Amino acid sequence: MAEAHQAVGFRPSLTSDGAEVELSAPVLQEIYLSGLRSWKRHLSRFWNDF
């Protein structure tokens, strides 16, 4: 009685979200990585001078 299931089966795997979050992490990660590559050009002055 303490433990019970709504249904024997489970909704479609497609409907379920495999990813832990879907805020936009994948997009954010790509933008951050791309920005870092570009950042080096802007950081060149500081980078050259220890």
N, CA and C of each residue as an Amber inpcrd file, in Angstrom:
protein
   150
   0.8620000  -1.2170000   0.0000000   0.0000000   0.0000000   0.0000000
   0.8810000   1.2440000   0.0000000   2.0140000   1.1620000   0.6930000
   2.9380000   2.2870000   0.7660000   3.4970000   2.6120000  -0.6150000
   3.7600000   1.5690000  -1.4000000   4.2990000   1.7460000  -2.7450000
   3.2910000   1.2800000  -3.7910000   2.9870000   2.1560000  -4.7440000
   2.0360000   1.8230000  -5.7980000   2.3830000   2.5600000  -7.0870000
   2.0210000   1.9620000  -8.2190000   2.2980000   2.5640000  -9.5200000
   0.9980000   2.9490000 -10.2190000   1.0160000   4.0830000 -10.9100000
  -0.1670000   4.5550000 -11.6210000  -0.5350000   3.5820000 -12.7380000
   0.4790000   3.0700000 -13.4270000   0.2500000   2.1280000 -14.5170000
   1.4160000   1.1510000 -14.6360000   1.1270000  -0.0500000 -15.1240000
   2.1590000  -1.0680000 -15.2830000   3.2130000  -0.6100000 -16.2870000
   2.7560000  -0.0630000 -17.4090000   3.6690000   0.4100000 -18.4450000
   4.1030000   1.8470000 -18.1770000   4.9650000   2.3690000 -19.0440000
   5.4560000   3.7350000 -18.9000000   5.2950000   4.5020000 -20.2090000
   5.0840000   5.8090000 -20.1030000   4.9110000   6.6400000 -21.2880000
   6.0420000   6.3760000 -22.2880000   5.9360000   6.8560000 -23.5120000
   7.0050000   6.6380000 -24.5350000   8.3400000   7.2440000 -24.1100000
   9.4280000   6.5710000 -24.4680000  10.7630000   7.0520000 -24.1280000
  11.0110000   8.4080000 -24.7820000  10.4360000   8.5940000 -25.9630000
  10.5910000   9.8410000 -26.7000000  10.0050000  11.0080000 -25.9080000
   8.8450000  10.7860000 -25.2970000   8.1980000  11.8370000 -24.5200000
   9.0440000  12.1990000 -23.3050000   9.7220000  11.2040000 -22.7460000
  10.5740000  11.4340000 -21.5840000  11.8330000  12.1900000 -21.9940000
  12.3310000  13.0410000 -21.1010000  13.5310000  13.8170000 -21.3920000
  14.7690000  13.1250000 -20.8310000  15.6010000  12.5950000 -21.7230000
  16.8210000  11.9140000 -21.3050000  17.7840000  12.8860000 -20.6330000
  17.8640000  14.0980000 -21.1740000  18.7500000  15.1170000 -20.6240000
  18.2630000  15.5700000 -19.2510000  19.2050000  15.8670000 -18.3610000
  18.8570000  16.3140000 -17.0180000  18.1530000  17.6660000 -17.0740000
  18.6320000  18.5410000 -17.9560000  18.0370000  19.8640000 -18.1060000
  17.8470000  20.1970000 -19.5830000  16.9540000  21.1410000 -19.8620000
  16.6880000  21.5440000 -21.2380000  16.5260000  23.0580000 -21.3370000
  17.1340000  23.7800000 -20.4020000  17.0430000  25.2360000 -20.4070000
  17.6880000  25.8050000 -21.6660000  18.8430000  25.2470000 -22.0300000
  19.5850000  25.6840000 -23.2150000  21.0710000  25.3800000 -23.0370000
  21.3750000  24.4790000 -22.1080000  22.7630000  24.1370000 -21.8190000
  23.5520000  23.8260000 -23.0920000  23.0590000  22.9660000 -23.9500000
  23.7840000  22.6100000 -25.2080000  24.1480000  23.8430000 -26.0370000
  23.1910000  24.7560000 -26.1830000  23.4320000  25.9960000 -26.9160000
  24.4380000  26.8560000 -26.1580000  24.2510000  26.9390000 -24.8490000
  25.1330000  27.7450000 -24.0120000  26.5620000  27.2140000 -24.0590000
  26.7050000  25.8920000 -24.0150000  28.0320000  25.2730000 -24.0420000
  28.7380000  25.5750000 -25.3680000  27.9970000  25.5070000 -26.4800000
  28.5730000  25.7950000 -27.8010000  28.9660000  27.2750000 -27.8810000
  28.1300000  28.1650000 -27.3590000  28.4490000  29.5940000 -27.4110000
  29.6950000  29.8900000 -26.5530000  29.7440000  29.3010000 -25.3640000
  30.8900000  29.5210000 -24.4770000  32.1850000  29.0300000 -25.1450000
  32.1440000  27.8270000 -25.7310000  33.3390000  27.2650000 -26.3690000
  33.7820000  28.1360000 -27.5520000  32.8050000  28.5920000 -28.3310000
  33.0980000  29.4250000 -29.4900000  33.6410000  30.7780000 -29.0580000
  33.0970000  31.3090000 -27.9640000  33.5370000  32.6000000 -27.4550000
  34.9790000  32.5290000 -26.9740000  35.3560000  31.4240000 -26.3310000
  36.7170000  31.2640000 -25.8250000  37.7180000  31.3100000 -26.9760000
  37.3960000  30.6540000 -28.0810000  38.2900000  30.6630000 -29.2330000
  38.4820000  32.0950000 -29.7300000  37.3850000  32.8450000 -29.7800000
  37.4200000  34.2450000 -30.2020000  38.0990000  35.1240000 -29.1490000
  37.8930000  34.7700000 -27.8840000  38.4440000  35.5250000 -26.7540000
  39.9660000  35.6380000 -26.8420000  40.6250000  34.5710000 -27.2740000
  42.0860000  34.5780000 -27.3650000  42.5660000  35.7490000 -28.2220000
  41.8870000  36.0540000 -29.3180000  42.3370000  37.1590000 -30.1690000
  42.3080000  38.4960000 -29.4140000  41.2380000  38.6580000 -28.6450000
  41.0330000  39.8600000 -27.8300000  41.9800000  39.8750000 -26.6240000
  42.2860000  38.6870000 -26.1200000  43.1890000  38.5000000 -24.9790000
  44.6540000  38.5060000 -25.3990000  44.9270000  38.5650000 -26.6980000
  46.3030000  38.5040000 -27.1760000  47.1950000  39.5290000 -26.4770000
  46.7310000  40.7640000 -26.3100000  47.5820000  41.7690000 -25.6730000
  47.9500000  41.3510000 -24.2510000  46.9510000  40.9650000 -23.4650000
  47.1800000  40.5420000 -22.0880000  47.9820000  39.2460000 -22.0380000
  47.6570000  38.3320000 -22.9440000  48.3330000  37.0410000 -23.0040000
  49.8200000  37.1980000 -23.3070000  50.1400000  38.0980000 -24.2310000
  51.5300000  38.3340000 -24.6020000  52.3160000  38.8770000 -23.4130000
  51.6910000  39.7780000 -22.6620000  52.3410000  40.3690000 -21.4980000
  51.9620000  39.6100000 -20.2300000  52.9320000  38.9050000 -19.6580000
  52.6900000  38.1370000 -18.4400000  52.2000000  39.0490000 -17.3210000
